[PDB]
From Swiss-Prot, chain B:
The chain holds residues 254 to 310 of 310 of the full protein. It comes from Homo sapiens. The modification Phosphothreonine is found at residue 13. This is 26S proteasome non-ATPase regulatory subunit 14. Component of the 19S proteasome regulatory particle complex. The 26S proteasome consists of a 20S core particle (CP) and two 19S regulatory subunits (RP). The regulatory particle is made of a lid composed of 9 subunits including PSMD4, a base containing 6 ATPases and few additional components. Within the complex, PSMD4 interacts with subunit PSMD7 through their respective MPN domain. Interacts with TXNL1. Widely expressed. Highest levels in heart and skeletal muscle.
UniProtKB/Swiss-Prot annotation, chain D:
Component of the 19S proteasome regulatory particle complex. The 26S proteasome consists of a 20S core particle (CP) and two 19S regulatory subunits (RP). The regulatory particle is made of a lid composed of 9 subunits, a base containing 6 ATPases including PSMC5 and few additional components. Component of a complex with USP49 and RUVBL1. Interacts with PRPF19. Interacts with TRIM5. Interacts with NDC80. Interacts with PAAF1. Interacts, in vitro, with the thyroid hormone receptor (in a thyroid hormone T3-dependent manner) and with retinoid X receptor (RXR). Interacts with ERCC6. The gene is PSMC5. Transmembrane segments: none annotated. Belongs to the AAA ATPase family. It comes from Homo sapiens (Human). It is found in: Cytoplasm; Nucleus. This is 26S proteasome regulatory subunit 8. Component of the 26S proteasome, a multiprotein complex involved in the ATP-dependent degradation of ubiquitinated proteins. This complex plays a key role in the maintenance of protein homeostasis by removing misfolded or damaged proteins, which could impair cellular functions, and by removing proteins whose functions are no longer required. Therefore, the proteasome participates in numerous cellular processes, including cell cycle progression, apoptosis, or DNA damage repair. It comes from the Eukaryota.
Swiss-Prot record, chain E:
Component of the 19S proteasome regulatory particle complex. The 26S proteasome consists of a 20S core particle (CP) and two 19S regulatory subunits (RP). The regulatory particle is made of a lid composed of 9 subunits including PSMD11, a base containing 6 ATPases and few additional components. Disulfide bonds: none annotated. Phosphorylated by AMPK. It is found in: Nucleus; Cytoplasm, Cytosol. Component of the 26S proteasome, a multiprotein complex involved in the ATP-dependent degradation of ubiquitinated proteins. This complex plays a key role in the maintenance of protein homeostasis by removing misfolded or damaged proteins, which could impair cellular functions, and by removing proteins whose functions are no longer required. Therefore, the proteasome participates in numerous cellular processes, including cell cycle progression, apoptosis, or DNA damage repair. In the complex, PSMD11 is required for proteasome assembly. This is 26S proteasome non-ATPase regulatory subunit 11. Belongs to the proteasome subunit S9 family. Highly expressed in embryonic stem cells (ESCs). Expression decreases as ESCs differentiate. Induction: By FOXO4; expression in embryonic stem cells (ESCs) is mediated by FOXO4.
Swiss-Prot record, chain F:
The lineage of its organism: Eukaryota, Metazoa, Chordata, Craniata, Vertebrata. This is 26S proteasome non-ATPase regulatory subunit 6. The keyword Transmembrane helix does not apply. GO terms for biological process: proteasome-mediated ubiquitin-dependent protein catabolic process. GO terms for cellular component: cytosol; extracellular region; ficolin-1-rich granule lumen; nucleoplasm; proteasome accessory complex; proteasome complex; proteasome regulatory particle; secretory granule lumen. PROSITE patterns: PCI (PS50250). SMART domains: PINT. Component of the 19S proteasome regulatory particle complex. The 26S proteasome consists of a 20S core particle (CP) and two 19S regulatory subunits (RP). The regulatory particle is made of a lid composed of 9 subunits including PSMD6, a base containing 6 ATPases and few additional components.
Length: 468, 57, 168, 36, 54, 374, 38
């Protein structure tokens, strides 16, 4: 009863801003987005995700959600007296007896701000009234009398889709900002039990309705939902992105775009790619927003640089290593050691030692080409090393035992185009060369057009950012 | 030749723009008066590069 | 999905996979490696033999073709391994002198097969080829001999200075 | 709805008019420095 | 040669020594090093930026 | 008085690195325990070396001596602070508590850092924290104390003691793979003649050369080793590595490899190097090969295989994995056995760093200047 | 932030990356025994 005043304070600090302030920031505002309380409220949703939200236990049971959802009314200027009601109900938790009125009694509590009066006209108060109670209910998924209620609370959020689609006005720059979060929690609670089936068409038509009339933070986030949907399950509709690539917003949330490029980097990694996939993995890597969230870059980075492992030109990756990730990369450290080593028995004994964590990865694409990566590491090293090597030297240095499969190796390496190396054809016996004096002057200034044209692009972008 | 010798003093102004907490009066707004000159310089460089292939044949 | 277990399940995937391997795809191979991965390494020789066979094909052996053809009818993969012989031979048409010096009759006999039909003669009279004296060359220079890098980048300087104009 | 959405968004594009307000500030600064 | 007393290449595969040295490039050295210092200065300014931001 | 305790640190390293005759560690630990009351050697040998074959009571008696010693130290703690002492009560207790178990340490540093008053109060405190660190292969103690020192000790200090702090910094710089600032801080040679910190000025020379044959480029090589004949009047006592350095100018690769094996074993059997000495030797290898090839191009490894000993296959795998280690741009074959002089920075790299950084930092500030708005 | 699925989850340390790069070359006599091999 002395700690629940801290949810009592932060609860009023949240819906003061949200209800009164963003309702006044919805009345006449939003020239581009003057709803700064929307980003303030998403900051407070991250604040309720740091802390306990409001009333999970808090030394009592079920105090705020029966309390504050009453009597908003939006009327004559003595509705700060309804705020005074909200404030002076707080003798119940400290003084009186707390009673259980959440997760069961919420079904008319959500209908209370509609059945008081014709409160107001805008939907962000309705999204408030169905989000700010019900998002404090989702992160307790103990699957007993709590997850069927997340299910029904997000059925009320599907009614919030209905009252997002037929609400009379660019309130989507608040409701899609909240709906990004809560539709991720939709996908979470729906897939804590089974794969979601008609929620796919929910998501399809929800992407459809956000097409042009209000195309603001909805398309990219629902596309992240759709992408991770097609990622977690069988892989049939990546041709949909190959035919309907409409994936380019303002890239607003500045981390949504980062992890979006990460997810589609995993896509192009699993389709087939080295180059474009590793460069968008690199751009998402350097577009890591901060390290203010403990060890969340780490597992996702273990799966990020799988393609760089598949390059073969990677050293040990240890600068990323969280020490709490060490006990999980007990396979992965020896795996990049098996990348640095050319042993074959160790190449399959790391697999024979860690196939279960390789299934935890669940990417066969790595081991279906990692032997080929070992022989390409060999050919890159030794073909960069010597001018006129023999195929027998490298062959029976890497246990090939015959000339003709070394010929097929050198031939498919010419076909893969690393070095000039040809064969002094009598019985093999490579006659070859390196390549210095290739070119060095007009060829840099070919790329310097892209250098400085990229620089002047960022000049004009800083100009259009200086405009703000 | 003088460009590599001139920019390296105005380049000391960001070292003087190290005015972190509260230390900045007028920013010594002299970072310019070299760029425009650099512009003209390489502008004419590209001009003449053109005029070579243009006039010469 | 809860169906009775399909009889030809193991080799319908193999028909599709060997047809894919014949028509030279690049990513449907990997969506095949993703739709049913768990039955590939433990069992299913109709799939376990083509996927390690692909590892051997892009490992560097067109002779594992014949080592394998020791036993792959596999209910009429015979047409598809004939198309696999075709993708041996036209990839020889590419990869016979990509950047080689020269081959002779015997390297034709090793990399190619069927010692001399009118089909390697058709190669020598179909790709623009010089059948040298028991000898081979791609051409007399093999590269078609690969002198002005200035004026095109001068036009680049035109639009480059132009884009540096109109902006500050 | 049918033919009533685009010019509202065009007045929304008067953020470009706000860009003109910014360039107005600019030319104010410049004109008065030149007055100096 | 190791101490700049001599500048050039000798030979035993051909037994023919050749002398050469043309170091000075004020453009590259000067401008590049000045730009390096500029990078350091921008690194400095990064913290003024991150501060005035938050 | 850390020189004998530096020898005790070497005793701990002998206990640590060579597990050949664990009784030898027990030997010198019992020898250091039978006098000087040094019981910490005896627990240290009990743990890692033999479990004290016969020292159950033969050193428990001197442990009780150390117990009475510590108890009378902590009693004079109050007997002397009964009188007025300008932090000198706590100074005496920290000095005498810097012998037995970590009890002495916890009654040493918990009673000085609180009332460390003047330069000496921390001068000796940081010297002896360097010693308590160096007893093991520590770096937290021997440089965290230098941090406190920066806050506490010098403030102008002496023309004598401050050079000693700097030589501590250089001594760890050679202890760690900081292959330059050691010799930089060991460039004094006029202020480290003999001290209770200098376990041996000849060992000073050892630590110095084991960082100067790398820090000192050929000009700095001759500057400090040749020109700086001040260390020569003393390094006259260790001519092996000296003559190695002499060849290190004329580039005599045969004796390079002889002394290379020699110094390899030496570092293999020398303190604060056990888990790291791997690179130094192959680094000497690649660095010498750099200049050797830099001689000219139309040359062979076989012509140098003589200097390599029989080094055709040796350097075959060696330089294969070295260029594989991304080292020493050059050209060499087996069927041709090439040598090369190449890699001019002012060819493209002196122009490639340009974008290497003006794109790294460009996009750094870009994304940095992206979240300023989004 | 880490709002993704991922919430599911110098002594020698400086020289250690090179050490694992040194983990493939004669870790630390056959060098010196090669002298008498010829």
């Amino acid at each position: 009863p002395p700690p629940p005043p801290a949810p009592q304070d932060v609860e009023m600090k949240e819906e003061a801003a949200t209800g009164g302030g963003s309702t006044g920031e919805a009345d006449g505002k939003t020239a581009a987005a003057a709803a700064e309380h929307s980003q303030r409220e998403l900051d407070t949703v991250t604040l309720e995700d740091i802390k306990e939200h409001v009333k999970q236990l808090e030394k009592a049971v079920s105090g705020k959600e029966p309390r504050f959802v009453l009597r908003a009314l939006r009327m004559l200027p003595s509705t700060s007296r309804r705020l005074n009601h909200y404030v002076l109900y707080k003798a119940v938790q400290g003084f009186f007896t707390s009673n259980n009125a959440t997760r069961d009694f919420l079904l008319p509590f959500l209908e209370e701000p509609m059945d008081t009066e014709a409160d107001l006209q805008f939907r962000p108060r309705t999204g408030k009234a169905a989000s700010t109670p019900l998002l404090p209910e989702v992160e307790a998924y103990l699957q007993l009398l709590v997850v069927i209620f997340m299910m029904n609370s997000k059925r009320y959020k599907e009614a919030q889709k209905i009252s997002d689609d037929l609400m009379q006005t660019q309130n989507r720059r608040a409701l899609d900002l909240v709906a990004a979060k809560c539709y991720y929690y939709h996908a979470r609670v729906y897939e804590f039990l089974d794969k979601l089936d008609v929620v796919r068409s929910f998501l399809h038509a929800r992407l459809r309705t956000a097409t042009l009339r209000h195309d603001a933070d909805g398309q990219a986030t629902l596309l992240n939902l759709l992408l991770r949907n097609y990622l977690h399950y069988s892989l049939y509709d990546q041709a949909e992105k190959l035919v309907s690539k409409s994936v380019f917003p303002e890239q607003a949330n500045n981390n949504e775009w980062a992890r979006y490029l990460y997810y589609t980097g995993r896509i192009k990694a699993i389709q087939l790619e080295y180059s474009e996939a590793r460069r968008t993995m690199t751009n998402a890597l350097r577009k890591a927003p901060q390290h203010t969230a403990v060890g969340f870059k780490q597992t996702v980075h273990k799966l990020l640089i799988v393609v760089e492992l598949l390059l073969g030109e990677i050293p040990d990756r240890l600068q990323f290593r969280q020490p709490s990730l060490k006990r999980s990369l007990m396979p992965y450290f020896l795996l990049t050691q098996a990348v640095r080593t050319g042993n074959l028995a160790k190449f399959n004994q790391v697999l024979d030692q860690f196939g279960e964590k390789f299934q935890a990865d669940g990417t066969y694409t790595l081991i279906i080409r990692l032997r080929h990566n070992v022989i390409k590491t060999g050919v890159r090293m030794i073909s960069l090393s010597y001018s006129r090597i023999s195929l027998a030297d490298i062959a029976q240095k890497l246990q090939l035992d015959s000339p003709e499969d070394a010929e097929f190796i050198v031939a498919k390496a010419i076909r893969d185009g690393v070095i000039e190396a040809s064969i002094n054809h009598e019985k093999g016996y490579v006659q070859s060369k390196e390549m210095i004096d290739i070119y060095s002057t007009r060829e840099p200034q070919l790329a310097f057009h892209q250098r400085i044209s990229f620089c002047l692009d960022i000049h004009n972008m800083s100009v259009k950012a200086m405009r703000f | 030749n003088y460009n590599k010798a001139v920019e390296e003093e105005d380049k000391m102004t960001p070292e003087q723009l190290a005015i972190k907490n509260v230390g900045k009066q007028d920013p010594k707004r002299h970072l310019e008066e070299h760029v425009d000159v650099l512009m003209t310089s390489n502008i004419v460089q590209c001009l003449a590069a053109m005029l070579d292939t243009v006039v010469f044949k | 999905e809860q169906l009775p277990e399909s009889a030809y399940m193991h080799q319908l995937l193999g028909l599709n996979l060997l047809f894919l391997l014949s028509q030279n795809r690049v990513a449907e191979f990997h969506t095949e490696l993703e739709r049913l991965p768990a039955k590939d390494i433990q069992t299913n020789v109709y799939i376990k033999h083509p996927v390690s066979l692909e590892q051997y094909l892009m490992e560097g052996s067109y002779n594992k073709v014949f080592l394998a053809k020791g036993n792959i009818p596999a209910e009429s993969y015979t047409f598809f391994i004939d198309i696999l012989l075709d993708t041996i031979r036209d990839e020889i048409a590419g990869c016979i002198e990509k950047a080689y010096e020269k081959i002779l009759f015997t390297e034709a006999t090793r990399i190619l097969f069927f010692n001399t039909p009118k089909k390697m003669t058709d190669y020598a009279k179909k790709r623009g080829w010089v059948l040298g004296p028991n000898n081979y060359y791609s051409f007399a220079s093999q590269q078609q001999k690969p002198t002005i890098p200035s004026t095109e980048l001068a036009k680049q300087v035109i639009e480059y200075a132009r884009q540096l104009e109109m902006i500050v | 709805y049918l033919s009533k959405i685009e010019e509202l968004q065009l007045i929304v594009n008067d953020k470009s008019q706000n860009l003109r307000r910014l360039q107005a500030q600019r030319n104010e600064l410049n004109a008065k420095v030149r007055l100096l | 040669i190791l101490d700049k007393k001599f500048h050039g290449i000798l030979d035993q595969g051909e037994g023919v020594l050749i002398i050469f040295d043309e170091p000075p490039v004020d453009k590259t050295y000067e401008a590049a090093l000045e730009t390096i210092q500029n990078m350091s200065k921008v690194v400095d300014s990064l913290y003024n930026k991150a501060k005035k931001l938050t | 008085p850390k020189n004998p305790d530096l020898r005790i640190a070497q005793l701990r390293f002998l206990l640590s690195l060579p597990e050949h005759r664990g009784d030898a560690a027990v030997r010198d630990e019992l020898m250091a325990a039978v006098r000087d009351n040094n019981m910490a050697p005896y627990y240290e040998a009990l743990c890692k070396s033999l479990d004290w074959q016969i020292d159950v009571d033969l050193l428990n008696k001197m442990k009780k001596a150390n117990e009475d010693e510590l108890k009378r130290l902590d009693e004079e703690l109050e007997d002397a602070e009964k009188n007025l002492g300008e932090s000198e009560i706590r100074d005496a207790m920290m000095a005498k508590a810097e012998i037995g178990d970590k009890e002495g340490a916890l009654t040493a540093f918990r009673k000085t850092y609180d009332k460390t008053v003047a330069l000496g109060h921390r001068l000796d405190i940081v010297f002896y924290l360097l010693r308590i660190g160096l007893f093991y292969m520590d770096n937290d103690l021997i440089t965290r104390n230098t941090e406190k020192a920066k806050s506490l000790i010098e403030e102008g200090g002496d023309w004598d003691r401050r050079n000693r702090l700097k030589v501590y910094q250089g001594l760890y710089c050679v202890a760690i793979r900081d292959f330059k600032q050691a010799a930089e801080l060991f460039l004094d040679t006029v202020s480290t003649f003999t001290s209770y910190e200098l376990m041996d000025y000849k060992t000073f020379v050892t630590y110095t050369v084991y960082v100067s044959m790398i820090a000192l480029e050929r000009p700095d090589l001759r500057e400090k080793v040749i020109k700086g004949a001040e260390i020569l009047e003393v390094l006259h006592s260790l001519p092996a590595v000296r003559q190695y350095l002499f060849s290190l100018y004329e580039c005599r690769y045969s004796v390079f490899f002889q002394s290379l094996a020699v110094v390899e074993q030496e570092m293999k059997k020398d303190w604060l190097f056990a888990p790291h000495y791997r690179y130094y030797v192959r680094e000497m290898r690649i660095h010498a090969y750099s200049q050797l090839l830099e001689s000219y191009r139309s040359l062979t490894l076989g012509y140098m295989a003589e200097a390599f000993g029989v080094g055709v296959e040796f350097i075959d795998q060696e330089l294969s994995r070295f260029i594989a280690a991304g080292r020493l741009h050059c050209k060499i074959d087996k069927v041709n056995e090439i040598v090369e002089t190449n890699r001019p920075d002012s060819k493209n790299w002196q122009y490639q760093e340009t974008i290497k950084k003006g794109d790294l930092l460009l996009n750094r500030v870009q994304k940095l200047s992206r979240v300023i708005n989004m | 932030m880490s709002e993704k699925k991922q919430p599911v989850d110098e002594d020698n340390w400086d020289d250690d990356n090179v050490e694992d790069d040194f983990s493939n070359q004669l870790r630390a006599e056959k060098h010196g025994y090669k002298m008498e091999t010829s």
